[PDB]
């Protein structure tokens, strides 16, 4: 294959879900929806009636689920959250201002949306292609925590002042907005519970928001193709257009990301509704390309597998990085991977390269690294692999307690 | 070699009576686990709570375990609308125990309440290696067990659906058992899918008559108590225990896990100079004088996150032997002596999965008659068979048939 494609889908489950996802199983491919489970209570100001059925759908369907938060943040978006807030929100406009505040509260955002999801759907954990309590992504922002050498952040993704498109933005991502500050916080928060997060290289939206019925003007297949075959190693979370939309310190050539872009879209795009005529003019678009991308050589895959799973029998080199059960692990030494041998804890073939700050056994810290423990902030003033007995508090040869 | 272990174990915190409780445990040398109710941290559970948080501190770092009671006690089933003067309104009417459960969906959600709420008054929380809050947990009323897929049990008399157990004409069947029964059931088991461990107690430190004005303070004298643990030793207290609605009927009695253990039961407001009576002055000496000679009498005390004995590398484990290992029970196929590179997992050829839960999972040694959730249906195991990838229920219709 000349590359990976991996379709991630933003803001379902609404109305709109279901006829995308039957255009995915029709296609033969697998996509990851990050979704916002406001949707099933009916207060997201979509058409949003059949929410349950999409969210059913999706996972019948082997699609990934994974987590957007719970109310898109919109709760800082007014005064006082409630179930006319998403069409408040939608009159005034203000989602990327103030979108984050507490980070907290805002964290909190997504584990409430696990409780929803498992209320609507109490057999929601028997699904393996439910990640929603592993499997994030942050409103309006294009950040990573990938591992613990891969994480960066849309430092300019949400304003205190004003929406970006205005005579005199201004975006410095040397001195972030606080909303930014805040989201930067939140990203971390999610880290020392588990998450990965993810960005994009790529967003499928309308070529002009200006025009009447703007999701009509959704990019066509072919010239989308084409945006993607510009994507493919090139670094374009750096490049991309709007601003908002920038991850400015991502790390270039950074070994998980080669050969691989990730395509942000939404599922409201793709419905005949207050946008315009979604279903009719885009469920066209992405099938065709589908079809196109993998005529070019190009296979769609989830991102539960974006970091590769670990395998027995693959070898590996010192330096490469796997997934096993939820957790980010380094090769210490080139070697091939064996039944009994599997990363852990204690495994000398593996250390943990989870993108979190809580100090964690296994783990390769650096010179310089900052880690939280029983409360306490610690440097590490010298590089080694943690273990049991050289916790931050007993071993000031290793770490420094902060003020 | 010490005479048995003793777990104890705190219900009902954080409450101004935690500080002092726990500063005798460190006087005393020993570590208790703390099965706290969040509600406490918001100044709603009607109790002397202002420092709630100063004790949630003080447990963490004192190294206390923190595991999970749910986030209101369920009080919500106690009234009819659930808010801030809810707690003083269900002790008015005494009504604890009636209807204590209902919506098993709604209930279980309580207990990831709590976590949000732990989160979010200590916000660092998760820095502490001795934080459970997502691990370990407890069910309001109910001496009930979900430790390992051969060790589970239910409390079919916990709680009720008309009379208290001390009221005339009260009926208790455990073969028939009460609709509240029946949904803590499923609570126990919702729990037991998202990674918890749930215990439930031996004995139950408590006043020993409940008919003075001042209760707290006929709770039992530290000598004939230990003559209580002394008695409970390897002799199946939860099926002898009174009252009626403590027992556990079809505890395991003899259970390898359980040999020479003696989980204690008891609640911090019993140790407050208060409501209840003199009990931070009549009985922190009493908790103080217990350690003390219960030492001497050659028991040890530890936590219930080691009550399933954590892996060790250069141990030795012999066949149908349970671990717990990075929160997952697993049980041992063969003797053998642990080593670094060879930890339990789901790969594993020395061990299999054992946790108590109910959805399909990879590497579990599955019995005929169980019954498997997958991708939101069920499945009776029809040949007992020990899981793998590729055998999903789903696929493989002669191992399992679909209900
Ligand atoms: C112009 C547009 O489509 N805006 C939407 C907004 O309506 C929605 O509430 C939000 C969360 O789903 O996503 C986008 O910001
Ligand atoms: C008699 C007594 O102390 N009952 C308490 C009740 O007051 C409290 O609200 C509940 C939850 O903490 O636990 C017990 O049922
Ligand atoms: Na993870
Ligand atoms: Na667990």
Redesign the pocket.
């Known amino acids: 294959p000349k590359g990976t494609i991996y379709l991630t889908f ?2 379902g489950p609404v109305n709109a879900s279901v006829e995308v996802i039957k255009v995915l199983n029709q296609g033969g491919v697998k996509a990851t929806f990050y979704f ?1 489970a406001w949707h099933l209570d009916g207060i ?3 058409n949003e009636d059949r929410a349950l059925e999409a969210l059913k759908l999706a996972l019948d369907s082997g699609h990934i689920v994974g987590n957007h938060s719970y109310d ?1 943040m ?1 709760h800082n978006c007014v005064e006082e959250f409630g179930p006319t807030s ?1 069409a408040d ?2 009159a005034t ?1 203000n ?2 201002i103030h979108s984050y505040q507490d980070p907290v509260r805002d964290a909190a955002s997504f584990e409430q949306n696990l409780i929803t999801l498992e209320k609507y759907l109490p057999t929601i954990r028997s699904y393996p292609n439910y990640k929603g309590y592993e499997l994030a992504r942050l ?2 922002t294009n950040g990573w925590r990938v591992t613990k050498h891969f994480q960066a952040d849309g430092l300019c993704a949400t304003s205190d002042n004003l929406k970006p498109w205005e005579p005199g933005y201004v975006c410095d991502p040397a001195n972030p907005s606080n909303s930014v500050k805040a989201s930067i916080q939140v990203q971390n928060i999610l880290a020392n519970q588990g998450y990965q997060t993810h960005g994009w290289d790529v967003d499928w939206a309308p070529e002009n ?1 200006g025009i009447p019925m ?1 999701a009509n003007s959704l990019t066509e297949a072919v010239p989308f193709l084409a945006y993607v075959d510009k994507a493919l190693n090139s670094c374009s979370p750096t490049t991309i257009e709007p601003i908002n939309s920038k991850t400015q310190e991502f790390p270039c050539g950074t070994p998980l990301h080669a050969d691989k872009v990730i395509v942000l879209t ?1 599922d ?2 793709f419905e005949d509704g207050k ?1 315009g005529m979604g279903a009719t003019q885009n469920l066209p678009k992405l099938a065709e390309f589908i079809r196109i991308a993998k005529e070019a050589g190009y296979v769609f895959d989830t991102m539960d597998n974006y970091t590769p799973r670990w395998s027995v029998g693959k070898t590996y080199q010192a330096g490469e990085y796997v997934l096993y059960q939820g957790v980010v692990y380094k090769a210490v030494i080139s070697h091939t991977a064996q039944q009994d041998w599997a990363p852990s804890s204690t495994s000398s073939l593996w250390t943990n390269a989870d993108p979190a700050t809580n100090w964690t056994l296994n783990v390769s810290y650096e010179q310089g690294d900052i880690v939280n423990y029983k409360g306490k902030r610690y440097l590490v003033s010298v590089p080694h692999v943690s273990q049991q007995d050289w916790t931050p508090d007993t071993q000031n040869t290793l770490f420094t307690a902060l003020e």
Do not use: A, K
Request: net charge negative; charged share 25%; glycine share 14%.
């Open positions: 933003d803001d916002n997201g100001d979509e898109h919109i998403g929100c939608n406009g989602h990327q409103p309006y928001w703007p939404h409201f795009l946008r």
